[PDB]
């Protein structure tokens, strides 16, 4: 469906103005007829974007109500009402058991539904942001007259007019223009104004001057044009549809959840029906056969687990909110940890998005300035008298000014009225020479010649601030070579000197080096005009050369670039040390893209492209073995004629990849290419041209300050302070939460065994029921909750940023090793500790373990109010039941006591508690509150009716203590083996 939109567009900028009118039945001068425009409206439809059909929240909520655990809990809830119905008909049961348990279980499903619904959130308003880029109104020429109309009423063929400050209402063929410049950052991510004129200037319509696009704005001048595309058919309207239309897809974390749901659901249905038939064979009435099944359901399903996961995710997202990293989708909290490839935009993401002075060439020396936002570098020069001469030209031969009321904000961050290069120079001098306004007050400008297309220079004449002179100084800047052809002397370390071929060659060298760094280079020179030839009232003519512009003194060079953000180089290296592959994907030109790649460490030192090898060896590129080149730089124009299989080979064959001059669909294609190889991919960006890629990414991260509204709609995560170091933190947090989820899951599952085994022995042994159904829910929904959550606050056991990204195909959240430990080893020890306390309670009340076998028949018989114990005493029905429920209560408390040790062992997968310590305060809180809850549930009056919880005698609490301790020792010995031999036996069997 969207495969059409993933392709590069076709256009009609090659046609003549006249020819273009024939195609759209239009007038170049009079414009369309009121009737013809209305006709075309009904024909083509409105100049608007329609949002894609969404899935209502209704269906979204209910889709969770049927996912493995909820299905089993539904079967339980209904099977409760089943047994209740069968009762209400047969023998009038005045009880509330099956009825209430059926109500409780149905509530558990609904509430669990809210948790998973909260986790599976999708806040997407892509198409809405795009719609915000179409103006409310447009100016059209109809019947030879200009009028404002609803922009939706704009059709292909009419004559539109735009001017500085307004949004392009539709894709236009420029037919007339006067000084028109446009901001195409929507399509390129670059905000430098692009001229628009009627002349065709490139075969590529996205590069030609005679096309203006919807989603962009006119920055200055005026233009008229013929509408060629409207609504969804515009270049960026298609990007809108592509972006808004892209199928979301399941996250890595989501896939893991479903996976263990299958496992646990599997064992549940297995043991469920495996013992349902095992009971009927033993001659159990279907009346009972279902009651046992309900218990089996409740025992096997970890009722509180899915909600635990959600809370652990939420708590991890809260910590990241506190580092200026907003998470829109709870699952995106983990994806960053599983990320193996980052596709990053350059401008406004890796870079500050601001022309900044990078180097200066004066005194036959290359000086480097500090490009960082917060200025974390050092000085270059202050002493040289040459510097002050260059500094003066940079301030004086400059027409840029700071906007009013910025004195509060830092120099480099403040808004400037002017072109990017003049702003850069302004901020450079203001920083290291103080107020520039002061320099422009001490040296009043009397005449100037602003930068001309033809002159290729800008000159200014000022009253020298010096009192002993107060004469006229000439300054000029422009193209380095043009400035050179106008110089005779060079200000070396203070004093001038003739411009010999020697210094002239050093100039060329300096010029070539700076240009090689992808930096824009300017020349600077001045000339102190002779006093006798220029009186204090001498008039200077700016129109006609009234003053010399030759034999001037060359002062120096200055170079500039849109520099990396301070934290970016280090963040890139850190991603790469964690084994994450970092690719650059930018709409910017290749020379600039490549230079920043080396600056931030995308391309490491020494690595070459095929073009680099060819130039170094002075040989044809076809003569170069492409396998000798680990780095590559792909232009979008070449990308366009490559198949995906060939794109896949590029991705496979290079470690250091730069995709430059890419369109928005091309970014999507590169992302998909990476994913196709089985990689989890993150995208980082800030422009509307990142929207499709951000949507398709497993996780999209947008910049918060510099980011466009669209990009932040398309993302899963926002960096609110533009701190790229947050990606590094995000991946670290993502890995940590993945491990801690394992700990929390194992902990929760472990207590399933002591809830399952009592029901089994109840059938096979014919003893009184050791633990009840209600009692199970008091564990999974009550006591285990806070402890399970607390594992989310566990510190790393080792340097997680030192390991490679997990293999999502092999490294699962829940594997066989977890089940073996939780179900086969620790849970089994917990089961016994439960049974022990059960036998203790009964034996101390007169029913010794031996006489318990095959007694349930008489025990449950409501009409036998005289059962004989081991000592020959006789018990009524309600009397023995009180002891039985007291058994449920102590078995319950036994679970809590054995979960104490389990909580401590689940703390660490490898390390010892004596190494990791007990610095998790939430965990300790869990221990205290868990025990408080259990005690309250046993001793609070009335709980014997609502939950069948009975007061325990002090000695009862200590039954499971020896089992709780064996768990601690056992797991500590086991992990001691793991560490002592990384070989594999204990490791490959039990290492979560």
């Amino acid at each position: 469906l969207d495969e059409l939109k993933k392709e590069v567009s076709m256009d009609d900028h090659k046609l003549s103005l006249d020819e273009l009118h024939n195609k759209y039945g239009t007038d170049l001068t009079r414009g369309l007829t009121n009737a013809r425009a209305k006709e075309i409206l009904a024909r083509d439809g409105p100049n608007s974007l329609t949002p894609p059909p969404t899935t209502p929240e209704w269906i979204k909520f209910c889709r969770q109500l049927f996912g493995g655990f909820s299905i089993l809990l539904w079967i339980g809830a209904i099977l409760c009402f089943l047994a209740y119905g069968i009762q209400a008909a047969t023998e009038d049961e005045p009880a509330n058991d099956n009825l209430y348990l059926g109500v409780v279980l149905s509530t558990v499903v609904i509430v669990t539904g809210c948790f998973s619904y909260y986790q599976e959130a999708k806040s997407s308003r892509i198409m809405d942001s795009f719609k915000n880029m179409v103006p409310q109104q447009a100016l059209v020429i109809r019947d030879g007259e200009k009028s404002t109309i609803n922009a939706e009423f704009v059709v292909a063929g009419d004559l539109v007019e735009v001017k500085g400050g307004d949004r392009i209402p539709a894709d236009l063929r420029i037919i007339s223009a006067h000084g028109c410049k446009v901001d195409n950052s929507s399509l390129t991510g670059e905000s430098e104004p692009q001229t628009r004129s009627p002349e065709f200037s490139s075969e590529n319509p996205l590069e030609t001057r005679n096309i203006a696009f919807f989603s962009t704005n006119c920055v200055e001048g005026t233009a008229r044009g013929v509408v060629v595309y409207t609504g969804d058919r515009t270049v960026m309207g298609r990007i809108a549809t592509l972006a808004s239309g892209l199928e979301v897809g399941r996250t890595p974390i989501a896939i893991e959840i479903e996976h263990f749901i299958h496992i646990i659901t599997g064992v549940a249905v297995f043991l469920g029906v495996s013992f349902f038939i095992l009971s009927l064979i033993l001659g159990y009435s279907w009346l009972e056969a279902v009651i046992f099944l309900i218990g089996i359901i409740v025992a096997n399903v970890p009722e509180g687990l899915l909600a635990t996961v959600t809370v652990c995710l939420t708590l991890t997202a809260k910590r990241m909110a506190r580092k200026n990293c907003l998470v829109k989708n709870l699952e995106a909290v983990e994806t960053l940890g599983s990320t193996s490839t980052i596709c990053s935009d350059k401008t406004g993401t890796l870079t500050q998005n601001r022309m900044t002075v990078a180097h200066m060439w004066f005194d036959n020396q290359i000086h480097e300035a500090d490009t960082t936002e917060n200025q974390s570098g050092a000085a270059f020069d202050k002493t040289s008298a040459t510097w002050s001469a260059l500094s003066r030209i940079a301030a004086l031969c400059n027409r840029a000014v700071f906007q009013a009321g910025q004195d509060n904000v830092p120099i480099l961050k403040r808004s400037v009225a002017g072109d990017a290069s003049e702003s850069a120079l302004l901020k450079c001098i203001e920083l290291c020479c103080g107020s520039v306004q002061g320099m422009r007050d001490r040296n009043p400008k009397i005449v100037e010649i602003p930068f001309n297309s033809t002159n290729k220079y800008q000159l200014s004449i000022h009253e020298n601030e010096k009192s002993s002179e107060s004469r006229y100084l000439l300054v000029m800047k422009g193209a380095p070579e043009r400035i050179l052809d106008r110089c005779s002397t060079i200000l070396l370390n203070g004093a001038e000197e003739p411009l010999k071929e020697d210094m002239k060659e050093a100039f060329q060298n300096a010029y070539l080096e700076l240009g090689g760094l992808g930096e824009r280079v300017l020349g600077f020179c001045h000339f102190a005009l002779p006093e006798d030839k220029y009186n204090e009232g001498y008039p200077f003519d700016a129109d006609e050369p009234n003053f010399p512009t030759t034999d001037l003194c060359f002062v120096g060079l200055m170079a500039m670039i849109d520099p990396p953000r301070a934290a970016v180089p280090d963040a890139v290296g850190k991603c790469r040390s964690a084994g994450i592959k970092v690719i650059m994907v930018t709409g910017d030109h290749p020379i600039t893209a490549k230079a920043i790649a080396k600056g931030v460490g995308i391309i490491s030192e020494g690595n070459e492209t095929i073009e680099d090898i060819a130039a170094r060896l002075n040989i044809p590129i076809g003569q170069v073995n492409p396998r000798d080149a680990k780095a590559c730089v792909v232009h979008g124009s070449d990308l366009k004629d490559l198949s995906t299989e060939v794109l896949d080979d590029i991705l496979h064959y290079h470690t250091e990849i730069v995709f430059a001059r890419t369109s928005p669909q091309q970014k999507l294609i590169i992302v998909e290419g990476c994913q196709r190889q089985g990689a989890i991919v993150a995208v980082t960006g800030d422009g509307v041209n990142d929207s499709p890629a951000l949507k398709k990414a497993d996780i999209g991260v947008a910049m918060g300050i510099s980011g466009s509204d669209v990009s932040k709609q398309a993302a899963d995560m926002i960096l609110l302070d533009d701190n790229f170091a947050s990606i590094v933190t995000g991946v670290e947090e993502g890995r940590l939460i993945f491990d801690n989820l394992k700990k929390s899951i194992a902990y929760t599952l472990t207590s399933n065994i002591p809830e399952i085994t009592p029901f089994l022995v109840f059938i096979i042994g014919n003893v009184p029921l050791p633990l009840g159904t209600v009692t199970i829910l008091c564990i999974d929904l009550g006591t285990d909750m806070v402890p399970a959550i607390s594992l989310a606050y566990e510190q790393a056991e080792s340097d997680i940023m030192k390991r490679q990204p997990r293999n999502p195909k092999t490294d699962k959240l829940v594997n066989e090793r977890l089940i073996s430990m939780a179900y086969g080893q620790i849970g089994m020890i917990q089961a016994l500790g439960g049974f022990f306390s059960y036998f203790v309670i009964l034996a101390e009340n007169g029913f010794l373990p031996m006489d318990l076998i095959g007694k349930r028949v008489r025990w449950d018989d409501r009409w036998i109010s005289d059962v004989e114990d081991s000592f020959g005493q006789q018990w009524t029905y309600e009397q023995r039941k009180i002891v039985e429920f007291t058994c449920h209560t102590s078995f319950f408390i036994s679970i809590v006591v054995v979960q104490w040790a389990d909580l401590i062992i689940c703390k660490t997968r490898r390390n010892s508690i004596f190494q990791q310590g007990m610095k998790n305060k939430i965990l300790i809180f869990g221990l205290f509150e868990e025990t408080a809850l259990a005690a309250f549930l046993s001793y609070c009056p009335g709980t014997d009716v609502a939950l069948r919880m009975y007061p325990l005698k002090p000695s009862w609490w200590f039954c499971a203590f020896p089992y709780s301790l064996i768990i601690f020792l056992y797991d500590e010995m086991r992990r001691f083996i793991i560490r002592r031999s990384p070989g594999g036996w204990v490791e490959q069997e039990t290492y979560y």
Binding site: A843, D869, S870, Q874, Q879
Partner: protein
Amino acid sequence: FLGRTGSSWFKIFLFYLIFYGCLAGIFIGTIQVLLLTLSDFEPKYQDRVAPPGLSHAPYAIKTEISFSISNPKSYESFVKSMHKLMDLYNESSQAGNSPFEDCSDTPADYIKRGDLDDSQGQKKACRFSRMWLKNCGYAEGKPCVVAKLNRIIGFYPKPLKNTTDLPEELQANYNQYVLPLRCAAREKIGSIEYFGLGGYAGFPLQYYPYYGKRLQKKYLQPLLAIQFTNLTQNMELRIECKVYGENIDYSEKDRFRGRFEVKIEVKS
């Protein structure tokens, strides 16, 4: 295979065999020590049997014994359980001076055979003739229910003293040696008739305290036969038999705590 190789499948079996073996051996060990802390003659706790329960022979479907006089197999169900109990009180079961003793044919005081020790043989229990149960196949019309006080080791059932007012106000009040049992329904549409030891409507105190199964096997607890020769027919009559005493109490939950709940209906 599914998971691993044969070598791995073996090792996982050798482990869980030794592992579960140890766990079973430990579980058994903790059961040993538990038993080691307990007496053979007396249970550690008795507060959960404390107030004695009162149970009868007619096995009630739901605290009810409804049947038809004009039908044979209508009551043959209740006669099965009635027989089961009384069959134990046979004279052939009580033979010789061992381990039985002839006790007062009239309600007497308690009898202490020492302590709950094995320092003596089987503590000798009082004989009880089912022949003390006058009038009661059993009552084919108007049932002859048999009451019973639940056995509790070392329990001395203490009758109420005639200090103040009483339900069966002072009639045949053998204050010193009889634990009374008065059945009731207002709703007085019956005819209560009690049979027992010495002809009294109670339990003779000479059968106490019970020394337990280990120290007193073949022991016989006193019975109290109750006959309802009601002149009514074809209606559910809620009859409650209540025992009175210092150590006797009741509960709204446990409807058998020192009392009966019988729903007789001679639907003939």
